[PDB]
Telomerase reverse transcriptase (Candida tropicalis MYA-3404), 645 residues
Amino acid sequence: EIIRTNVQEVLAEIVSFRGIKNVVSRIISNDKKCRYDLIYNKYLSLKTMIDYSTKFNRVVEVVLIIMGKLLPLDAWGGTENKKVIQDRIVDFLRLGANERLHLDDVLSGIKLSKFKQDFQIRKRLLEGYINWVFISLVKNIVRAFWYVTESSNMDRSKLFYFTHSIWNELSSNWITKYAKGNLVQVVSPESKGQFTNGKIKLIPKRGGFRVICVPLKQSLYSFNNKRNFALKQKEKWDYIFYQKYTLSPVRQVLQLKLNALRKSDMGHRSSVNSTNEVADRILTFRNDLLKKNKTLPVLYMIKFDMKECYDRLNQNALKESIAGIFKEDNENTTYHVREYGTLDEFLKLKRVRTLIEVDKVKTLSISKNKIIEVCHSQIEDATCLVKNKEGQYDLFKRKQGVFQGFSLSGIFCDILYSTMVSKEFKFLWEATEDNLLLRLVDDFIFITSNKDTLKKVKDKISSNELQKYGAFVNHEKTVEINGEAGSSNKMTFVGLDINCLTLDVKKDSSQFSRPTCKFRSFKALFSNLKQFYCSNLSEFLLDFSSNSLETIRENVDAILKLTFEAIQTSFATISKQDSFERYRFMKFLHVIIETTIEKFARVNGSMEGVEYLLTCIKITITKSLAFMATKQEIIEWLYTLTIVD
């Protein structure tokens, strides 16, 4: 029950002879008589959520035990090619068996597969065989036994295998408890519920789970009727058209109104869009202080975060904030924004590898009435489906707050907190020379030389004046230092170590650890660094529903810089014993760039921002290769890459 295709179909997958059918038959035969649920009894059966996960070594052992039973020794093509393929299987399991397979990296066996001038171009079938072994056999085994989710952690290269039996038990328990305190049932909502339904996804947030709502591309009727494929396809394109022509414009106009307020109001400059911007605003604060009084004064600083900002978000305050940024447009205004494609466009109408080597605008138009209507609909009509354990899939709505995982949830929280910061902290932006406030999603930092204005901020985050917006200060996480030789002088803000005494800002970078660069060849270095890149390129850092583009870009830049730092560190050593070939390096760059763009489109479903990201990648790659004297042809090739038109 691992291979659900016949010998005729599998052999058809390996060509666009007779020994092949001999192997496929023996593999399929072993599949039918393999005692799967006895292996499960032998190998796979409290008080933090990740401890229930199967340890990775037991995960690997189960997979290889199945693979050994499924594939006879000749099916591996040698008693040593088996060692190589098994190592690539472990690498594939370290990516959760969910990332794209690269046949040029996995394949390092040579001849010993005796059908198990042109034998090489007719070895393209070996690519089709190994591909079927990895994507059909290995992946289905993982899907058969485990649910795989990446943790929300500090080090999020960690993928976790929960057996379906224990994952369902953990998930049903947390969801039942979370539904009582945050949700309320629904028996017949509006007929217009086609694009406001979502399914609950859980992420192992330490003591519990993060609750994410993934938008359903169907109506409830189509979801309950799993057999009406045509209707599901019809409504799938309804969402695609709704996302392209309605949701994307609404998000674009909200982002522009929010950007224009960063320049207009002084109260919105305190709202910062990324971590590097937090560092730069502090470094500029430090530098401007060194110019204003020529020394560095004793500085006081306070950091504080919000408790469950999405769950506790005030829907009414959010709706007022949205009306606020549109107060000047007289409720008949049409805005002109760009059109973008969907991921599922090229796929289902064209072919793969959408990054290739006359102009375009492709504008759309949307009115303020629609924007207000769609925003209200997303806030007030968002519903989620919960597994019932009587197999019923009831529908629930939020008592208060906004579901994380919908298109506008991230920008909703940005609009409200920018509005909140601007109206509530008025006594900060006529004396900017002495104090600095910065906002990053839900984390706040405030640095000042005025110990009196420190108490103003310290007394406002202790009152209830921010609860009007749904902001509740996480008091036990509040940290304050002053560096009067009586307190500590190091504080950790988001990703940053900040010295209170000298305003030194240094990045932790421990989230993505050592790229392990010590090899005797560039090919071995690029394969390892390709593994490292995909292992750290998690979906949440490409999620446009929860992060800004500057945050998405800087995260890609952070992974890139670590990857190229490995190249720079070991280039001289490897170049001593292996000649650097620029064309092999460009294929590595092309694979690295393609994977990032593909996963970004996969996560967000919309092509909005791939252009901005592709050119930020070119600039980052250019900068990161400054150490390389001879790169003109490499960089010239890099600059000719575009998104498929």
